[PDB]
From Swiss-Prot:
It catalyses: UDP-sugar + H2O = UMP + alpha-D-aldose 1-phosphate. Substrate binds at F55, Y86, R138, A143, D150, H155, E157, S262. GO terms for cellular component: nucleoplasm. Its cofactor is Mg(2+). Belongs to the Nudix hydrolase family. GO terms for molecular function: GDP-mannose hydrolase activity; metal ion binding; UDP-sugar diphosphatase activity. Its EC number is 3.6.1.45. This is Uridine diphosphate glucose pyrophosphatase NUDT22. Changing E181A: Abolishes enzyme activity with UDP-galactose.
Length: 291
């Protein structure tokens, strides 16, 4: 799957909020473009002069993520974050010239991402009480990944000493995106576990943090909540469910070609971190069928 690369696979079946540190620093920001950031401003002006109701918004930028030695005590992950914006994303990652910016960054900085906005997304592998994962169909009329299958998620907007509030905002954001799009009560959701981070190579390498969330409702109940908002309560055009049993071989199905890159990353990380048992009982052939 060349359109998705794993940047991080978490240990222990996934990390809780209390095990993660963030360093938010302007050293983790995008570098100014070689010929100047005026190129970004020109793309933005052209867009606003066609769609004057659009607005900019701040975003977190992923610089890097370093895992502690496995089995250690104390904090397990350090996320190095900067700040970026929707405007800067449109002028870099989404630009027709994004590959030229990646080559220039390798030359100038030894960093293919140095000239890219790289806003951090969030996504969830959301499990029901009757052991299905939740999928969403994207509208065929949007700009990004039209008509494709997604999982719940979004791109969080900003507002270890400011570090811990940043980690809290990331974990909050994945729950809030589930509540806003799927119309589930907050009290039916578990605290998220971070499974890992994946990159979308069709979008010049922008990354998403992928989480596992459990819901106390069944698939039928989740469907009822989603539909009861009406067509204006959700951006997606439908909801559907796949048994966790069957997510194991999803990359061999015809559904795989219809999944957007960030949703593929969520499912790869679910299968590696939550599926793939390590002990004798769950590894036995009747519970882990061969092939």
């Amino acid at each position: 799957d060349p359109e998705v690369t794993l940047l991080l696979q978490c240990p222990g079946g996934g990390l809780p909020q209390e095990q993660i540190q963030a360093e938010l620093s302007p050293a983790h920001d995008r570098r100014p473009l070689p010929g100047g950031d005026e190129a970004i401003t020109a793309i933005w002006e052209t867009r606003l002069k066609a769609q004057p109701w659009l607005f900019d918004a701040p975003k977190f930028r992923l610089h890097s993520a370093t895992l502690a030695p496995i089995g250690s005590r104390g904090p397990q992950l350090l996320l190095r974050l900067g700040l970026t914006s929707y405007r800067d994303f449109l002028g870099t990652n989404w630009s027709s010239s994004a590959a030229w910016l990646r080559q220039q960054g390798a030359t100038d900085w030894g960093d293919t991402q140095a000239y890219l906005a790289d806003p951090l997304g969030v996504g969830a592998a959301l499990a029901t009480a009757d052991d299905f994962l939740v999928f969403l169909r994207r509208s065929r009329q949007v700009a990004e990944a039209p008509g494709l299958v997604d999982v719940p998620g979004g791109h969080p907007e900003p507002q270890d000493l400011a570090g811990q509030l940043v980690v809290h905002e990331l974990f909050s954001s994945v729950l809030q995106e589930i509540c806003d799009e799927v119309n589930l009560p907050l009290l039916t959701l578990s605290q998220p576990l971070l499974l890992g981070i994946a990159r979308n190579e069709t979008s010049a390498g922008r990354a998403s943090a992928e989480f596992y969330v459990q819901c106390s409702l069944t698939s039928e109940q989740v469907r009822k909540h989603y539909l009861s908002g009406g067509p204006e309560a959700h951006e997606s055009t439908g909801i559907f469910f796949v048994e966790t049993q069957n997510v194991r071989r999803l990359p061999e199905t015809e559904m795989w070609a219809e999944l957007c890159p960030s949703a593929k990353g969520a499912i790869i990380l679910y299968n590696r971190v939550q599926g793939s048992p390590t002990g004798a009982a769950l590894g036995s052939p009747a519970l882990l069928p061969p092939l």
